[PDB]
Design a protein around this motif. Structure first.
Motif, PDB file in Angstrom:
ATOM      1  N   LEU A 142      32.942  15.017  -7.366  1.00  0.00           N
ATOM      2  CA  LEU A 142      33.264  15.316  -8.748  1.00  0.00           C
ATOM      3  C   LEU A 142      34.776  15.505  -8.843  1.00  0.00           C
ATOM      4  CD1 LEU A 142      32.659  16.092 -11.679  1.00  0.00           C
ATOM      5  CD2 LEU A 142      32.027  18.407 -10.895  1.00  0.00           C
ATOM      6  N   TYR A 143      35.442  14.650  -9.620  1.00  0.00           N
ATOM      7  CA  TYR A 143      36.898  14.682  -9.739  1.00  0.00           C
ATOM      8  C   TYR A 143      37.275  15.042 -11.150  1.00  0.00           C
ATOM      9  CZ  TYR A 143      37.055  12.245  -5.269  1.00  0.00           C
ATOM     10  OH  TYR A 143      36.880  11.880  -3.949  1.00  0.00           O
ATOM     11  N   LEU A 144      37.973  16.157 -11.298  1.00  0.00           N
ATOM     12  CA  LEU A 144      38.226  16.734 -12.598  1.00  0.00           C
ATOM     13  C   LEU A 144      39.702  17.150 -12.687  1.00  0.00           C
ATOM     14  CD1 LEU A 144      35.003  18.867 -13.084  1.00  0.00           C
ATOM     15  CD2 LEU A 144      35.605  16.764 -14.305  1.00  0.00           C
ATOM     16  N   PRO A 145      40.175  17.491 -13.887  1.00  0.00           N
ATOM     17  CA  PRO A 145      41.606  17.837 -14.023  1.00  0.00           C
ATOM     18  C   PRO A 145      41.995  19.005 -13.140  1.00  0.00           C
ATOM     19  CG  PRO A 145      40.622  17.427 -16.188  1.00  0.00           C
ATOM     20  CD  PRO A 145      39.472  17.497 -15.171  1.00  0.00           C
ATOM     21  N   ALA A 146      43.257  19.057 -12.714  1.00  0.00           N
ATOM     22  CA  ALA A 146      43.701  20.048 -11.738  1.00  0.00           C
ATOM     23  C   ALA A 146      43.534  21.502 -12.207  1.00  0.00           C
ATOM     24  CB  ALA A 146      45.140  19.792 -11.379  1.00  0.00           C
TER      25      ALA A 146
ATOM     26  N   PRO B 178      24.477  23.505  -8.524  1.00  0.00           N
ATOM     27  CA  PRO B 178      24.469  24.661  -7.604  1.00  0.00           C
ATOM     28  C   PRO B 178      25.617  24.638  -6.576  1.00  0.00           C
ATOM     29  CG  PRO B 178      22.294  23.645  -7.788  1.00  0.00           C
ATOM     30  CD  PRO B 178      23.256  22.701  -8.430  1.00  0.00           C
ATOM     31  N   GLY B 179      26.042  25.818  -6.146  1.00  0.00           N
ATOM     32  CA  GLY B 179      27.102  25.937  -5.159  1.00  0.00           C
ATOM     33  C   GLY B 179      26.882  25.089  -3.916  1.00  0.00           C
ATOM     34  N   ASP B 180      25.629  24.997  -3.452  1.00  0.00           N
ATOM     35  CA  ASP B 180      25.318  24.269  -2.224  1.00  0.00           C
ATOM     36  C   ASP B 180      25.698  22.787  -2.331  1.00  0.00           C
ATOM     37  OD1 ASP B 180      24.303  26.496  -0.913  1.00  0.00           O
ATOM     38  OD2 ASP B 180      22.187  25.923  -1.166  1.00  0.00           O
ATOM     39  N   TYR B 181      25.633  22.248  -3.541  1.00  0.00           N
ATOM     40  CA  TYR B 181      25.927  20.838  -3.757  1.00  0.00           C
ATOM     41  C   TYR B 181      27.420  20.553  -3.548  1.00  0.00           C
ATOM     42  CZ  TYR B 181      21.400  20.205  -6.328  1.00  0.00           C
ATOM     43  OH  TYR B 181      20.084  20.143  -6.709  1.00  0.00           O
ATOM     44  N   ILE B 182      28.229  21.606  -3.604  1.00  0.00           N
ATOM     45  CA  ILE B 182      29.675  21.467  -3.574  1.00  0.00           C
ATOM     46  C   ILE B 182      30.213  21.551  -2.130  1.00  0.00           C
ATOM     47  CG2 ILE B 182      31.829  22.494  -4.484  1.00  0.00           C
ATOM     48  CD1 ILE B 182      30.013  23.363  -6.977  1.00  0.00           C
ATOM     49  N   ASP B 183      29.320  21.784  -1.172  1.00  0.00           N
ATOM     50  CA  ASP B 183      29.677  21.873   0.248  1.00  0.00           C
ATOM     51  C   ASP B 183      29.520  20.525   0.947  1.00  0.00           C
ATOM     52  OD1 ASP B 183      28.450  24.015   2.990  1.00  0.00           O
ATOM     53  OD2 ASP B 183      30.026  22.487   2.942  1.00  0.00           O
ATOM     54  N   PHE B 184      30.624  19.915   1.383  1.00  0.00           N
ATOM     55  CA  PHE B 184      30.537  18.646   2.100  1.00  0.00           C
ATOM     56  C   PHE B 184      30.862  18.756   3.573  1.00  0.00           C
ATOM     57  CE2 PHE B 184      29.312  15.121  -0.428  1.00  0.00           C
ATOM     58  CZ  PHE B 184      29.118  15.779  -1.634  1.00  0.00           C
TER      59      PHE B 184
ATOM     60  N   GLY C  25      33.422  19.676  -2.704  1.00  0.00           N
ATOM     61  CA  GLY C  25      32.814  18.584  -3.445  1.00  0.00           C
ATOM     62  C   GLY C  25      33.348  18.420  -4.859  1.00  0.00           C
ATOM     63  N   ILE C  26      34.230  19.332  -5.258  1.00  0.00           N
ATOM     64  CA  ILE C  26      34.947  19.260  -6.517  1.00  0.00           C
ATOM     65  C   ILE C  26      36.415  19.147  -6.148  1.00  0.00           C
ATOM     66  CG2 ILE C  26      35.591  20.456  -8.642  1.00  0.00           C
ATOM     67  CD1 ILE C  26      32.801  21.803  -8.656  1.00  0.00           C
ATOM     68  N   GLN C  27      37.062  18.104  -6.644  1.00  0.00           N
ATOM     69  CA  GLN C  27      38.423  17.807  -6.260  1.00  0.00           C
ATOM     70  C   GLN C  27      39.194  17.373  -7.505  1.00  0.00           C
ATOM     71  OE1 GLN C  27      39.698  18.451  -3.366  1.00  0.00           O
ATOM     72  NE2 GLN C  27      37.849  18.700  -2.076  1.00  0.00           N
ATOM     73  N   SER C  28      40.513  17.443  -7.417  1.00  0.00           N
ATOM     74  CA  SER C  28      41.360  17.051  -8.522  1.00  0.00           C
ATOM     75  C   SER C  28      41.390  15.538  -8.723  1.00  0.00           C
ATOM     76  CB  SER C  28      42.775  17.552  -8.300  1.00  0.00           C
ATOM     77  OG  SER C  28      43.619  17.032  -9.305  1.00  0.00           O
ATOM     78  N   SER C  29      41.330  15.120  -9.984  1.00  0.00           N
ATOM     79  CA  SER C  29      41.441  13.714 -10.378  1.00  0.00           C
ATOM     80  C   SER C  29      42.895  13.296 -10.565  1.00  0.00           C
ATOM     81  CB  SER C  29      40.700  13.468 -11.690  1.00  0.00           C
ATOM     82  OG  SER C  29      41.363  14.170 -12.757  1.00  0.00           O
ATOM     83  N   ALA C  30      43.827  14.231 -10.387  1.00  0.00           N
ATOM     84  CA  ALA C  30      45.245  13.913 -10.622  1.00  0.00           C
ATOM     85  C   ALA C  30      45.667  12.805  -9.672  1.00  0.00           C
ATOM     86  CB  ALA C  30      46.134  15.160 -10.440  1.00  0.00           C
ATOM     87  N   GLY C  31      46.171  11.709 -10.199  1.00  0.00           N
ATOM     88  CA  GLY C  31      46.497  10.594  -9.324  1.00  0.00           C
ATOM     89  C   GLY C  31      45.503   9.446  -9.352  1.00  0.00           C
ATOM     90  N   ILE C  32      44.260   9.739  -9.733  1.00  0.00           N
ATOM     91  CA  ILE C  32      43.236   8.704  -9.952  1.00  0.00           C
ATOM     92  C   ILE C  32      43.414   8.033 -11.313  1.00  0.00           C
ATOM     93  CG2 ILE C  32      40.758   8.211 -10.026  1.00  0.00           C
ATOM     94  CD1 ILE C  32      42.039   9.270  -7.310  1.00  0.00           C
TER      95      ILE C  32
ATOM     96  N   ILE D 219      36.111  11.644 -12.896  1.00  0.00           N
ATOM     97  CA  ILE D 219      34.900  10.964 -12.409  1.00  0.00           C
ATOM     98  C   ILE D 219      33.789  11.935 -12.140  1.00  0.00           C
ATOM     99  CG2 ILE D 219      33.902   9.399 -10.730  1.00  0.00           C
ATOM    100  CD1 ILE D 219      36.735   8.403 -10.042  1.00  0.00           C
ATOM    101  N   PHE D 220      32.741  11.830 -12.956  1.00  0.00           N
ATOM    102  CA  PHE D 220      31.492  12.517 -12.704  1.00  0.00           C
ATOM    103  C   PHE D 220      30.702  11.711 -11.669  1.00  0.00           C
ATOM    104  CE2 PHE D 220      33.002  14.128 -16.715  1.00  0.00           C
ATOM    105  CZ  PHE D 220      32.692  15.481 -16.666  1.00  0.00           C
ATOM    106  N   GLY D 221      30.997  11.970 -10.396  1.00  0.00           N
ATOM    107  CA  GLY D 221      30.343  11.274  -9.308  1.00  0.00           C
ATOM    108  C   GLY D 221      29.059  11.954  -8.881  1.00  0.00           C
ATOM    109  N   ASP D 222      28.572  11.609  -7.694  1.00  0.00           N
ATOM    110  CA  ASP D 222      27.232  12.014  -7.275  1.00  0.00           C
ATOM    111  C   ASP D 222      27.048  13.538  -7.272  1.00  0.00           C
ATOM    112  OD1 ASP D 222      26.665   9.293  -6.922  1.00  0.00           O
ATOM    113  OD2 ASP D 222      27.037   9.395  -4.748  1.00  0.00           O
TER     114      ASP D 222
END
Length: 330
Positions: A225-229, A274-280, A293-300, A304-307
């Motif tokens: 999941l890539y979202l604004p910083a 859930p929090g568990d989904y965010i652990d890679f 599992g949640i990261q910044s989209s800055a630069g993309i 992106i609402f990914g898996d």
């Protein structure tokens, strides 16, 4: 008509999902990565540079009675992760979970980049974004969904991705047993070729929901999941010991940490990740540092609402004249 096919994670992290696809006559079954963020159906094949094939199942058009070479046609694609592939183009009969499209463009790879070679589990991609993004030249080709649309009972497909478990892609119908409560639908813009929509905001853990417009795409072919910083910083600030690491290339956190949930808005409705989904998992084998599992989209250049996001929901890709996206909890 309808189709229904099971999609299965390629590994213990849900890095991607593969779905069996029947190509040709007799059928050749390949496991493809269904990608709502691109619009090419391409496969490892008998034409792929042998040194770039490493364990994948290949399509051999010369063994298919229904394969037809699209004269002079070529394709070449680059993905957001820097991956790429290219080759020539066949049409053939393609079936997904019982749904058959005749004359589907099947793009045969002559060349693939190393990340594809090194992933033995993915035999190719099946694009489900809008056909305006298709890379076949000189004449663009239609996606599997586009070709199937007019035949479908309803012009839709749905993604029901599993958390560390298999899930389902359905074509032509909405399985009303597959989700809880109701589906909330939201407008789509097709101007960039994506399933692009506007989330209505977010919450971190049990915090109050922040109402704010977040433009982004629903992309089954992106892991995270890539979202604004601003949003991403707000999330990781609630995780003890979390930090952004330029060395690693994103937010990391102690593997022993408890992760809060993350909520995103769909109209007045809410999907909770859930929090568990965010652990890679560990950043490298044996590390006590884990990758977020949640990261910044800055630069993309796009959110992106990914898996990580989509697997928390039952998602309707409504391909009617005016397309929409629907989201339900499950």
């Amino acid at each position: 008509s309808t189709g229904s096919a099971t999609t299965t994670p390629i590994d213990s992290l849900d890095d991607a999902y593969i779905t069996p696809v029947q190509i040709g006559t007799p059928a050749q079954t390949l496991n493809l990565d269904f990608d709502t963020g691109s619009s090419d159906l391409w496969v490892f094949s008998s034409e792929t540079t042998a040194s770039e094939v490493d364990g994948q199942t290949i399509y051999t058009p010369s063994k298919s009675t229904t394969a037809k070479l699209l004269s002079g046609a070529t394709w070449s694609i680059s993905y957001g992760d820097g991956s790429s592939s290219s080759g020539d183009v066949y049409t053939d009969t393609v079936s997904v979970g019982g749904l058959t499209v005749t004359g589907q463009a099947v793009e045969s790879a002559k060349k693939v980049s190393s990340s594809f070679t090194e992933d033995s589990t993915i035999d190719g991609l099946l694009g489900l974004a809008f056909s305006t993004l298709n890379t076949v030249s000189p004449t663009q080709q239609k996606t599997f969904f586009d070709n199937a649309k007019a035949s479908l009972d309803s012009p839709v497909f749905t993604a029901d991705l599993g958390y560390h478990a298999p899930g389902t892609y359905n074509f032509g119908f909405i399985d009303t047993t597959a989700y809880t409560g109701s589906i909330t639908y939201t407008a789509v813009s097709t101007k960039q070729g994506f399933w692009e929509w506007t989330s209505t905001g977010y919450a971190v853990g049990s915090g109050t929901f922040k109402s704010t417009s977040i433009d982004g795409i629903a992309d089954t072919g992106t892991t995270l999941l890539y979202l604004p910083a601003t949003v991403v910083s707000a999330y990781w600030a609630q995780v003890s010991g979390a930090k952004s690491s330029s060395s690693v290339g994103g937010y990391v956190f102690p593997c022993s940490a408890t992760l809060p949930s993350f909520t995103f808005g769909v109209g007045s409705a809410r999907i909770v990740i859930p929090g568990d989904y965010i652990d890679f998992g560990p950043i490298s084998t044996g590390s006590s540092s884990c990758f977020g599992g949640i990261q910044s989209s800055a630069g993309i250049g796009i959110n992106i609402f990914g898996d990580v996001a989509l697997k928390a929901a039952f998602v309707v890709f409504n391909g009617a004249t005016t397309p929409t996206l629907g989201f339900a909890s499950k």
